[model samples]
Target: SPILGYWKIKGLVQPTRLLLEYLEEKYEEHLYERDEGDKWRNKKFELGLEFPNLPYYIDGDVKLTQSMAIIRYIADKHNMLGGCPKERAEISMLEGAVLDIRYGVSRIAYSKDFETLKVDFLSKLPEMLKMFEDRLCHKTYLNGDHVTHPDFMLYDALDVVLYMDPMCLDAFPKLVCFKKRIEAIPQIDKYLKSSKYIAWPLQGWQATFGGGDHPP
Candidate 1:
């Protein structure tokens, strides 16, 4: 079994966690409590990783850091990258596209100018979301009928945005259905419903929104 180390909050680790559950991979989590940041610092150097950081994955001889690195490793191991060169290329492209949205919301969430940033973000969001919605309109998933790694990224990112603005996806019905399509997976459904799921606090408590139980 592999061990994943990250803050107790879902933050950047949930996508990997979602993929793990979907793969039914048995793994251990080393959740660092928010208040115990120093403990992770002390343990960081001892982990033998060249670049010690949160959201690391350790499996046998494999020691990895970076969220996407760990994700690609596991996904590649399970043949989830893609079935062909074109699929792999599009998967990579979609991964970057999904991440752009994820980071956009995250920046505003953790910014000093919450309201102003939120307003600007909302104004431009429809255009951004419509692109994804249009992409999903023609396929069951972002990578077409076959599920790919970016699908997990898309799910988590969309979930975060929806949490930020529940009605944002109303105009993008295909996007909404795409979300449901991923959630409908038996493994994902089980993990989401189970008590182990962390449905709130999309980020650390330092943010202006999605940092705790209540959002502003």
Candidate 2:
């Protein structure tokens, strides 16, 4: 198999890396600094890939642009897509929910109308988390015993909340437990401790969340 290479920011790339780690696949994580000069453009052109985006995956001669596409491709390749047909459907539903939350919060993060965004999500989260709580009431994992792609999505969601709003989980006990359970996974735990895991500086508001001033 050809090497899998991804150019990405740390947070945006974390879920993809976690999926690979869960599958125990060895690959490279290339953290590229944001650059807009001709040099960056030329490098992308020379690679014969002209998407002009981060989080692109190069698997041999195949260059992929979309993040979710790259994630699903890897999941299918590793047989970690889901355990069965029903499970796969459930994974899709859960992933959709996660995407909704992520994009909703992202809008708040990017807008000057943050008060409205904050109020909306704050009111919305309990209802949202209640849904997750109900789903997880009798199940350890989202799709029965095995960790599915939805688990990775949940982990990423919790991670975003943990970084963005430290108090985000105060009322969502089940969600906190859900996050802790995913964090305790052996593969995830190992990767978190691995020195090779790239720890890049989060920019702007991300810096505040990442608990750093800037890159040294």
Candidate 3:
């Protein structure tokens, strides 16, 4: 059976979409549009299973929730996760680090200490980004030469940072080039250019839900 994903019209599933796109996995999305009222909520309430959420995913008998879990699940299925145990652990570790940044990114935008937090995020970010820059040294992907789950995950997370502060990425040369490499991927490039692509959001929640030109 084809993979059927439900995640509004956009949001957290993008990394999932990116992996599927890069791997050329056949999938379809059930997007709940704003004008359509609470269709997503209503449907999930009707289905009433697996902690019904916006970014819910379904694959035959298997159903999943949470962004990272789903991305990893799909990646493992395609063998794009990692080559071995150590590399897989490394991929999870890399993703774990991205989550810490996600906490900060989620805050600074809406924080009561917005300015101070923003400045701090700007200052502290390069140090974190440098880790990826170092790991990316002479390699095409963070896990290895082939693009994988971690690459897309980190790229999206950094993109959020870039939204808040573009200058921060300048100090990390390899990381910047890594973004270029991922963006230039023919499959990735096409989706990024399409109406389906959600541009960088001003708010974290907006990534999965709002503030982009809509496609028919």
Candidate 4:
């Protein structure tokens, strides 16, 4: 089985987990708990990964780090990258765009002035989400009718954004539709509702906002 190692927190690995589940890949996870100080450090160098980091995936001969690299690797293996040149181009663009959305809020969630930063971030969120809403209205998936890597990225990205304001996406019906579409995927829905799902501490313990146990 493939082995995925990361902090117990959802952090950057949830999207990769989502993609794995969507592909129905039977895999094992090695979770490093925050309470157990530096447990990952002991094996960090031992793993054969050139750039050892949290959220590493080891599948037979494949030793990979970096969340996006792992995600794309899995997607490419399964031919989920795209169906054509234009599709691949759009998928590539959306991949970075959604990551920006995820990180934009993550910075605020982990900031010292969370409340102040959140207010400012929320003010411009509608403008950003509106673009996605318009995009989703035309395409069943981010790039085309079939699923692509960015579709998974956008799902996790939107989910993290919603963690800040539960109703932040209410104004965008298409975005809501897209969220529901992803959640309704049989494998994804099962995994999300299962006990194995990690639903808390979207960031590390040091995060001022998102670093806490939340209800699953």
For candidate 3, write residues 1-216 as lDDT tens digits. Answer: 445455443346666777888887777677655454466556776653576665767777667777777888888887766778888788889888877776667655555557676767777787788778888887888777677787887877877677666677777889888888999999999988888765634343333222344421
| TM-score of candidate 1 versus the correct structure, residues matched by position | 0.95
Q: How many angstroms is residue 193 displaced in model 4 relative to the true structure, after the best TM-score fit? A: 1.6
Q: Compute the lDDT for candidate 1.
A: 0.86
What lDDT does the true structure give each of the candidates? 0.86, 0.68, 0.70, 0.85
Backbone clash count for every predicted candidate, in the order shown: 0, 0, 2, 0
Candidate 4 lDDT by residue in tens digits, 26-56? 9999998887556887789998999999889
Sort by TM-score, top down from the best: 1, 4, 3, 2
Cα RMSD for predicted model 4: 1.6
Q: Report how far residue 121 has shifted in candidate 3, in Å.
A: 1.5
Q: TM-scores of the models, in the given order? A: 0.95, 0.80, 0.85, 0.94
CA lDDT, candidate 4, residue 62:
98
lDDT of 1 by residue, 107-198 (tens): 77887888888888889889988888889878987877777778888899888888878999989999888988898999999999998788
TM-score of 4: 0.94
What local lDDT does model 4 show for residue 106?
Answer: 79
Per-residue CA lDDT of candidate 2, range 1-216, in tens?
A: 433444334555567788888888767654444453344455665555557455667776477656687788888877867768887787788888877866666656656566566776777776777788788877787776777777787777777656556787787777778788887989888988998565553323343333243444
Off by over 4 Å in 1: 213-216
Q: What's the C-alpha lDDT at position 131 in model 2? A: 82
Error of 3 at 32 (Å): 2.5
Which 10-residue span in candidate 3 carries the lowest summed lDDT?
207-216
